[PDB]
Subunit: 115 residues, 4 copies
Amino acid sequence: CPLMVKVLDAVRGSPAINVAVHVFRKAADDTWEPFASGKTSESGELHGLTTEEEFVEGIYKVEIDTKSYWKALGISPFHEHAEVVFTANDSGPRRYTIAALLSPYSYSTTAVVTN
Amino acid sequence: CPLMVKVLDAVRGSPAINVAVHVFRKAADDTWEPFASGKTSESGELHGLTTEEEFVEGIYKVEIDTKSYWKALGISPFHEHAEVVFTANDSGPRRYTIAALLSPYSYSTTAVVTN
Amino acid sequence: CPLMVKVLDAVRGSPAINVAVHVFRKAADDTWEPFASGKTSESGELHGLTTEEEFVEGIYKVEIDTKSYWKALGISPFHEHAEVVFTANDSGPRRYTIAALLSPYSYSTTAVVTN
Amino acid sequence: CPLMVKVLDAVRGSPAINVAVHVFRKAADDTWEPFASGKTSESGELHGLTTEEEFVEGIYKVEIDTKSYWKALGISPFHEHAEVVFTANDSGPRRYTIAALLSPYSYSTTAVVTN
Ligand SMILES: O=Cc1ccc(Oc2ccccc2)c(O)c1
Ligand SMILES: O=Cc1ccc(Oc2ccccc2)c(O)c1
């Protein structure tokens, strides 16, 4: 599990459950191609998106559908989604955790990169 | 100024100066078209991006070139850029201020919508 | 104004208005003594807290009454208040801006030190 | 383990290791009395501070010594420490995770509260 996504809700102080997540990888032709997708679990975590074999050097985009999330809680949020864009696996393979903390008009994202 | 961008640097505790900012508007074929751009001023702000006449309802993307900012300071950054995607919507006469606070492996962004 | 405070609301995407702010200076017996206070303005800002003559080097604490702010909006908050503790130090002629971005279970704060 | 503390470094994108943490509990006489203390582990987490028997209703202060942390990395940071102040265990016992994300001039803190 070289790529993991974790989402917290800053209004409720709890994991953000059932948040859709789509990952894309920048193609040879500069296009965003579909790489992996998942929903967060009761702990707000999404494991198993990829494998170290699949997850090669590349520019990746992790899209967290925060608008759907807030709307289901009756909140009409500012952002369409949270987008995280980064180069992965230059120094060789690493483990990436992409965290986001969500509020209706604000979010933050941090990466924790290992080995 | 219906739309303003403000960037701060969390490592140095200062406005983030000379950061390039590109704004796009989503067009009918779901493609991003270039709408407005500039670089932040000594105060970390970018004013004069658009006019009320131009700024119509629609989905906009604001892209903050964080990677180049960190590179020109010698600091190894994680993200390619910071992205903010939102729907501008009447109701109204709102000023949108898109603010962002930058660290090498983390950013936050918030929208302040007034008047 | 050598010291300014600025608060934003991440749930509503607006300045945080009428938030009480207390500033203290640490005295010789390691006790906090009341230095300056006020409430944020319609723009979420609090100016005029001190003067350059008064603001000498020392350890200061800035306490933002977040709990009362959330309660007057009906939202159940986690923190009693947000606290910022720092050493003011010459080098210099700096303006200190203490900014804070508020959610019910989360806050961030940043210092912007200029001139 | 009803109280856990987790600290991330936003400059390095890694857990913040060996960060001292002190917890206080507000006494009957309005004084902050010493409750528990610990250092974060290689994962940036601090477990075992207290027990559900010990950890009664109260107002608590979690002090994270961020200045020592940054100074050991050669950074002279803005803040003396991060202070998190909250009422614990009104609805009966809960599980509290206090997270902080650190930068030299900025930090954020979020609580995740369970059961
Ligand atoms: O403290 C956390 C934090 C505080 C404020 C921020 O944005 C602004 C900074 C200064 C003025 C207005 C907004 C922000 O992005 C993060
Ligand atoms: O303090 C602000 C803050 C703290 C933690 C965060 O991510 C995590 C939350 C809990 C555990 C681990 C990481 C975060 O995104 C913001």
